Design a protein around this ligand. Structure first.
Ligand code: ADP
Ligand code: ADP
Ligand code: ADP
Ligand code: MG
Ligand code: MG
Ligand code: MG
Lengths: 366, 393, 366, 366, 57
């Protein structure tokens, strides 16, 4: 019974190999009290921190795909194995996922913790973009994995990766949550604390969408109330948002809204394709796969198709693949990979790691 | 009293959407400083780069988006094309000047080009050097002006392929541009000797001349205004671009003289007689500045500036007959990049959605006032004015 | 003769362009009687409400930079033009100031009132932080504008603003006034009414200061009476305060004193600089400009320099610019701007607004 | 006083004929503002763009030795004559440089601009590799000109060039700068904007070197801290780099690090020699001349000698000529050529061009 | 450390920000696991690393 753990910047998905959906999905946060106790646990991790967030200071151990605190990172993993999965980490091999172009130092620390702290029998690290392509049942395609910390575009052709064509965009769900916080102040709603960041994140996940034509949508929102929606705060107050529903996701296609010099996700995907060989660009155009929670906005696939088509030559067939379960594509692909019979040769034993070190982990991994 | 009375102080430029542009156009790479673009309410003409000879791309306004690399072009010249100008009285007639020392008049089919166009209607061979200046007569029918690098200005009759007038001993150096006046009886020209000249073509005499209008050695322009004044853009001794207003009855000192910046590139002025607004577009610049010419001093009022992040290689202005009146649009500029043509819409902000009488007075129509035979005799007539209210939707 | 009106949360400064100091400075309060009249004006605005505050209930029309009552907002403007300046608003163009990241709805209402209610011939709206840079004669710098409602940090480089790096702190003079009221109860003095709030505000403006080292100052005040000061109440009673002189301004650098999760003004200024481009942070470190009345505490500049120096790298030169006139920096910068010959092109005529609307005001303004 | 202008992809070197070093050396960049001006020049070229790069978007008019924008290219030339040299182009003949196998269309545009836009009296275009041989005082040898846009290998024997043996490598300093940016992310440093590209380029020019044995150097860097160096960012932050010092220049000898199928500079130089006749390969082996800024890495000459010696037969004497001033060898050779008495017959008059056209420029030039 | 192992020894008076290029005790070829000052000598410290060696400094 191998374990598949997909640890991201914002959410941590865990489960067992062979299952169709992750068993445990909880926020990757660690909360600590910020007041003084007066009536006769110094940290809360995951859902328990979300329920007590009114008196806690919520901090993300992973920021922009970089672990800013390894002490809190082990709390997420400890909460995963014992509290969420309720299993012994030393009795199940663990399949881990890593971001594309992951630094070797980051992989070494993750491997060291799994073998020395949790004493897992076997361990393996897989690329998130590759696992996303596993779920879709394809060997060729470019994966636009946009999550909470960073956005990546990874082209794969016939099972061969092209690291030189991998592009990174420092713009993901958390940056959109902060942008929604900024533009909500223009409507008179003030969210400032870390607890209110999770409230605004809930608003973004429920009311935000991507407009096919941004300027046309702004004109519609400025002359009608049809695009108006209401959200109820935890204390019973009801807030109302208008054009902010499609203005917040628009920063993905127009990063200049955040003061960023980089290009949008549509141009980043196009630029990654153009960095590949000419003979493989045709297959990448028709196999654009969306993954991550930040790609769950309604109408983001149609907008991506329209934007890429305007960039690609007219003779190419642009096809955006947006499966309904793409929020868990990395975990689902990892579950499929861990259940394959031809995968048991990729496991790395704890005994092998003890006598060889992290060198055997850099090999056998990409 | 606090704010100068004007209707165009808040005119803003807005480029059209991506799907409404013209891409994959190999714009010409000729160092000659011309507009590189001519647009009428029917077609869009852009000078393109050809491996052999010269050609320009004429495509319908509805043919937006990416343009096929094998799209038929008007390739009849044996040398690179320098200037193109649509006939004001015929939306399907365009004259082109090239480096082969010839001027050719073309007839474009209604639906565009299905095969490459090589045989023109009329070939004008009267210049010994390359022709980079072409200006149709505003009123007289089938009358065309061509000014080559031989410092010779020629008046042609397109209908009969006849050379009506020849003006040779009037320009001692290279001619920069030639612009007709309102009625078409006179034309002004800027020359390399920093001299503005007003010349009567039917009499071959020099009406008024201003020596050293701009002290700079960089290229300078001169255009005629509707009321009868000359607006010139030039450089100073300190290589500072300037705008000047000249009175043909008094040229000792300019009416106005304003300095814009110290950047390079000649300033191409685009005059709108209906609104009395001059759009100054410099070659290689990323900004469009519009000024209003009124009788109140300093006779040149800076309205605003449209700013972009891409330099322009050329620019053509859509006449009044092709603008969207219902959207309070007073000017459309087809900005030319190195591989793209991006229309830019100038819109007067107005709350009302009805027709704006003040913004759209009567404009010159596509019907000629006189003919070539009548104009030679000495007849002078104003352009026939039409109403833009019928264009409202 | 153009008018410059700098209307803030707590004070309203008005005058004429070209003058060195505002001619009319009065509190932005509207007072209404709370008792019944027994002997044979239902509202008082400004100084007249301050002289009769014993029988009035004082209300601030602006709270945290947000206008909570536009009917009272017009009373402040009407009192400014007719009672304070004693001029006809329809004969002078009016230059107005707005907070950074001002909502467009707030600007539309302010523009509508000036053109439709007061019929001003011309009007322009300027950013307060930019005007504060005009008074100091600089084009590059970060302005920490701390007033009565809110605190803002606006970095400007070579005349270019960076809206993405603009940070907001919901802590200003009024929050410090309420904190002084709370900690004065511990000394035995009870101030509860709105009239007594103005009394405590006078105590704050006269006896409070920022300590260079808070812990050392607290120890000094606990073993000596040298820091003790006396204040005379309007009715003749004399109150005496000790460590409350430097404890009240300390909430600016330690917002946890008010139960706030946000960081201090020193960290907000540092975080705003860090949000800018790396190549411009050097100029922002040496051009930190203090603006507003809240930055008038003695020793606040020295504490600001010491705190930022501990955050910035040792190779950076931290310079805090605290002009003695910074309480009126926004108005003085507006007076300078309104007198420039190159500014006359930025006026918006009343006739233009009638035929075009508020769209021409969103343009020409930043 | 003839002018010698050496325009490259990254840097522009200009000066007067007869001088021993270029008078003006500035980056070949054009910067445009990317923010909105709020305080009452739309482009910056050269050093003024480098000093304001924080609020500008820097763009190179020349990419891979190809002029991607002739409007910005004229800005570089205008900035050279008027702002850097402070001379009138119409009074001095100009000697220009062209890349080997330069397209005739590229030369025609350069000739047309100098004669029409700048009205130069005389003009001539020379091959950069030929000029680099002049500076070394040799008539026989193969020049490996590696600059910012492209790497060229040009064999010359007894003053006769062999165009059929000229090899091109699309790999130069700019590709190494981008590679350094990619591998710096593995250490936790994020450089994404065009302004940070110049910062990383400065790191490359100061801390990078070529290792004689790459495998041994990697082992040394993995077991010691002696190869660590520190770099101070403009904002005072200090970063440390280890094996990245010699990994970035290693892409020159191992282009597979960038995903490129082509061979290294050592093999490209060897392949160019083998394309020549057998009787001249002996002289080319002992006269390998290094030119350009990308050949200024410490230890690149020793590495080049070791690699070519392995490829070449044992009986051949391999000599790598790396003068200390090879960064300006093209300009130095041009100044030497323009100062020769016999070079005055190679000038092309403006009057001759006006009556003959670019045909006379294709002749008299190679 | 990027390569090998090292530990930072600085005087107690050297407070504040420490330079990134401050000299360290970098003699081990593997990461240092433990350090212990000599009780009878305030200038002698022993360190153990992953290279299976113990070094006294
Ligand atoms: N339905 C939704 N619509 C829009 N955004 C969503 C939705 N669901 C999740 N997200 C966003 O996705 C982000 C994280 O997605 P995910 O990829 O699962 O996390 P990670 O990248 O950490 O693995 C969150 O910041 C959240 O805001
Ligand atoms: N000398 C002073 N010392 C301390 N605080 C002061 C001083 N002068 C004014 N203040 C406080 O500064 C606050 C804001 O003043 P001001 O800048 O006029 O606010 P606004 O920005 O709303 O106009 C006031 O509430 C006042 O209490
Ligand atoms: N000391 C150095 N070490 C390594 N690279 C350098 C050095 N100096 C310059 N360079 C590189 O050389 C390139 C340009 O060099 P050069 O050939 O002189 O000009 P260009 O290539 O623009 O004609 C730059 O991209 C720069 O990165
Ligand atoms: Mg993920
Ligand atoms: Mg204020
Ligand atoms: Mg070079």
């Amino acid at each position: 019974a191998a374990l598949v753990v997909d640890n991201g910047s914002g959410m941590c998905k865990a489960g067992f190999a062979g299952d169709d959906a992750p068993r445990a999905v909880f926020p990757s946060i660690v909360g600590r009290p910020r007041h003084q106790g007066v009536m006769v646990k110094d940290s809360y991790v995951g859902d328990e921190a979300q329920s007590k967030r009114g008196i806690l200071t919520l901090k993300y151990p992973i920021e922009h795909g970089i672990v800013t605190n390894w002490d809190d990172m082990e709390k997420i993993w400890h909460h995963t194995f014992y509290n969420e999965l309720r299993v012994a980490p030393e009795e199940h091999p663990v399949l881990l996922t890593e971001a594309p172009l992951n630094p070797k130092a980051n992989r070494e620390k993750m491997t060291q913790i799994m073998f020395e702290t949790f004493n897992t029998p076997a361990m393996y690290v897989a690329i998130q973009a590759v696992l996303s392509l596993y779920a879709s049942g394809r060997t060729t395609g470019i994966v636009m994995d946009s999550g909470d910390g960073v956005t990546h575009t990874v082209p794969i052709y016939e099972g061969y990766a092209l690291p030189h064509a991998i592009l990174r965009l420092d713009l993901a769900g958390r940056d959109l949550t902060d942008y929604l916080m900024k533009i909500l102040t223009e409507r008179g709603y003030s969210f400032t604390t870390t607890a209110e960041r999770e409230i605004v994140r809930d608003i973004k996940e429920k009311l935000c969408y991507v407009a096919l034509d941004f300027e046309q949508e702004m004109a519609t929102a400025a002359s009608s109330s049809s695009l108006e929606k209401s959200y109820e705060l935890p204390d019973g107050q009801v807030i109302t948002i208008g054009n902010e529903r499609f203005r917040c996701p628009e920063a993905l296609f127009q990063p200049s809204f955040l003061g960023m010099e980089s290009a949008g996700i549509h141009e980043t995907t196009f630029n990654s394709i153009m960095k590949c060989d000419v003979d493989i660009r045709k297959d990448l155009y028709a196999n654009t796969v969306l993954s991550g929670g930040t790609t769950m906005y309604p109408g983001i696939a149609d907008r991506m198709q329209k934007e890429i088509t305007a960039l690609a030559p007219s003779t190419m067939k642009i096809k955006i693949i947006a499966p309904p379960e793409r929020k868990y594509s990395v975990w689902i692909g990892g579950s499929i990979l861990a259940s394959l019979s031809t995968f048991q040769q990729m496991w790395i034993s704890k005994q092998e790691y003890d006598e060889s070190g992290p060198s055997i982990v850099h090999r056998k991994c990409f | 009293k606090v704010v100068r009375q004007s209707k165009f102080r808040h005119v803003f430029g807005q480029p059209v959407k991506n799907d409404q542009c013209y891409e994959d156009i190999r714009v010409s790479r000729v160092t000659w400083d011309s507009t590189f673009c001519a647009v009428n309410p029917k077609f869009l003409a852009v000078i393109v780069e050809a491996s052999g000879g010269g050609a320009f791309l004429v495509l319908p306004l509805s043919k937006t988006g990416r343009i096929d690399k094998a799209y038929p072009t008007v390739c009849g010249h044996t040398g690179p094309v320098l200037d193109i100008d649509w006939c004001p009285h015929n939306d399907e007639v365009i004259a082109s000047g090239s480096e082969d020392c010839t001027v050719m008049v073309w007839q474009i089919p209604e639906n565009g080009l299905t095969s490459p166009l090589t045989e023109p209607v009329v070939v004008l061979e009267g210049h010994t050097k390359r022709v980079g200046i072409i200006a149709w007569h505003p009123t007289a029918r089938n009358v065309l002006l061509s000014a080559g690098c031989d410092n010779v200005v020629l008046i042609w009759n397109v209908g009969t392929a006849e050379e009506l007038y020849r003006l040779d001993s009037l320009h001692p150096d290279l001619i920069y541009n030639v612009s007709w006046n309102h009625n078409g009886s006179l034309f002004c020209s800027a020359c390399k000797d920093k001299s503005v000249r007003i010349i009567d073509p039917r009499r071959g005499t020099l009406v008024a001349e201003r020596e050293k209008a701009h002290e700079g050695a960089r290229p300078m322009r001169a255009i005629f205004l509707a009321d009868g004044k000359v607006f010139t853009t030039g450089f100073s001794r300190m290589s500072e671009r300037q705008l000047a207003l000249w009175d043909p009855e008094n040229l000792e000192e300019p009416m106005a003289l304003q300095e814009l910046d110290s950047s390079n590139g000649a300033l191409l002025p685009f005059y709108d007689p209906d609104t009395s607004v001059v759009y100054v577009c410099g070659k290689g610049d990323s900004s469009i500045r519009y000024f209003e010419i009124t009788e109140e001093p300093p006779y040149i009022h800076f309205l605003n500036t449209f700013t972009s992040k891409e330099p322009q290689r050329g620019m053509g202005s859509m006449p009044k007959r092709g603008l969207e009146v219902s959207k309070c649009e007073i000017a459309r500029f087809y900005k030319l990049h190195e591989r793209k043509c991006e229309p830019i819409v100038m819109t007067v902000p107005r709350k009302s959605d009805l027709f704006q009488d003040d913004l759209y007075p009567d404009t010159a129509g596509p019907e000629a006032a006189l003919e070539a035979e009548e104009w030679v005799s000495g007849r002078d007539a104003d352009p026939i004015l039409i109403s833009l209210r019928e264009a409202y939707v």
